[PDB]
Amino acid sequence: AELACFCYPHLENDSYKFIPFNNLAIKAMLTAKVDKKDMDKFYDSIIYGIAPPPQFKKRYNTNDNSRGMNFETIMFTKVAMLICEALNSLKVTQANVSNVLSRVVSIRHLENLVIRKENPQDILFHSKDLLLKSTLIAIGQSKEIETTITAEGGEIVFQNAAFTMWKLTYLEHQLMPILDQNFIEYKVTLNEDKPISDVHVKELVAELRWQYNKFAVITHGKGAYRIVKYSSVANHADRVYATFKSNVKNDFNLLDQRIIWQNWYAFTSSMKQGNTLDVCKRLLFQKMKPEKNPFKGLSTDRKMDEVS
């Protein structure tokens, strides 16, 4: 979803400030009869302020759409405000503006940031600075990499001196939850962006083999691991390749080769080498030669530990 789904620009003294949409104004627009030459221009509901350009109808859930978002929830307002707070601290200019709002962000990441932001126990509740760093990263306005402290959050199910594993709560989301009730995904953030001892990497892999054996360790390349079901690596491969495709504007971190699933490492490093999808994806389905296990006996140890 484009950032233009949550707010509109407004000049206030040479600089642009961003304002949240009223769900009722959006509703009005979904009702409106606009001309084809105004589909890109913001809409005026008259009664509830401005609304997103009519061309974004698809982003909002109606009776004929469940593919969009639930703009009538408080989460929408909350997410809009989270975005506006970030874009306003940037003092954007009359030129960089359109490009900013057209940026496509992940709503689940944004809603997850709100869940963090509103919890008094979360450090983000007390650091209005860390909160911005966390948001800017989310809306692609920060060179910085997402690490634990600035992570989208979720439920911590493992913590190391190097990593923090989160269980993504996308199902219990209000704005745009995962509909597939059979969904489960985890994210591993690096506590610090620095060197990691082999012992600490061994601790993580140990956990991921014992607790998440039916899951594949992959990454979207922005500095964090994604623990997804093997029965869903395919769709990830597509989505990540598609995004690499739009390389007309494009780094990609392959992350530790001792952690990442062998096939995924191949499929991605292959893609980084600038190959075709069919060439890459092909590497994903082929049973490769058993690589030399870096940490042997991991499972056997954890097993005996249990027994005692």
Residues forming the site for ligand ANP (CB under 6 A) = 106, 108-109, 146, 220, 222, 224, 226, 239
* Closer by beta carbon to ligand ANP, 57 or else 108: 108
Q: Which of 39, 234, 242, 279 binds a copy of itself (CB under 8 A)?
A: 234
Coil, helix or strand for 123?
Answer: helix
* Closer by beta carbon to a copy of itself, 63 or else 246: 63
Question: 195-214: b or e for each residue (b if 16 or more CB lie within 10 Å)?
Answer: ebeeeebebbbbbbeeebee
* Closer by beta carbon to ligand ANP, 222 or else 303: 222
Element (H or E) spanning 150, and its range? none
Cβ atoms 267, 283 nearer than 8 A: yes
- C-alpha 110/C-alpha 239 separation (Å) is 19
Q: Which of 5, 45, 259, 260 binds a copy of itself (CB under 8 A)?
A: 45
Q: Which of 231, 250, 257, 293 binds a copy of itself (CB under 8 A)?
A: 231
Give least dist CB 250 to a copy of itself, A.
26
CA atoms within 13 A on the CB side of 281: 13
- C-alpha 284/C-alpha 263 separation (Å) is 5
- C-alpha 13/C-alpha 168 separation (Å) is 41
- C-alpha 94/C-alpha 98 separation (Å) is 8
Give least dist CB 97 to ligand ANP, A.
23
246 binds, among ligand ANP, a copy of itself, none (CB under 5 to 8 A by kind): none
Per-residue contact string for residues 235-274; x = within reach of a copy of itself by CB under 8 A: ----------------------------x-----------
DSSP summary character for residue 190: E
Please give the structure tokens belonging to residue 21. 């949409």
Q: CA distances (Å), 15 to each of 4, 18, 50, 135, in order?
A: 17, 10, 19, 20
Q: Is 42 in the site for a copy of itself (CB under 8 A)?
A: no
Whole-angstrom Cα Rg for the chain: 22
Give least dist CB 216 to a copy of itself, A.
8
Q: CA distances (Å), 95 to each of 14, 51, 54, in order?
A: 12, 21, 22
Q: Is 182 in the site for a copy of itself (CB under 8 A)?
A: yes
31 binds, among a copy of itself, ligand ANP, none (CB under 5 to 8 A by kind): a copy of itself
Place of tokens 């703009």: 71
Give least dist CB 109 to ligand ANP, A.
5
Per-residue contact string for residues 135-174; x = within reach of a copy of itself by CB under 8 A: -------------xx-x-x--xxxxx---x----------
Element (H or E) spanning 215, and its range? strand 215-219
**β-bridge pairing 215-219 and 225-229:** antiparallel
Instruction: State the residues that interact with a copy of itself by CB under 8 A.
Output: 22-25, 27-29, 31-33, 45-49, 63-64, 119, 121-123, 148-149, 151, 153, 156-160, 164, 181-182, 191, 203, 207, 210-211, 213-214, 216, 229-231, 233-234, 263, 284-285, 287, 290, 299-301, 303-304, 306-308
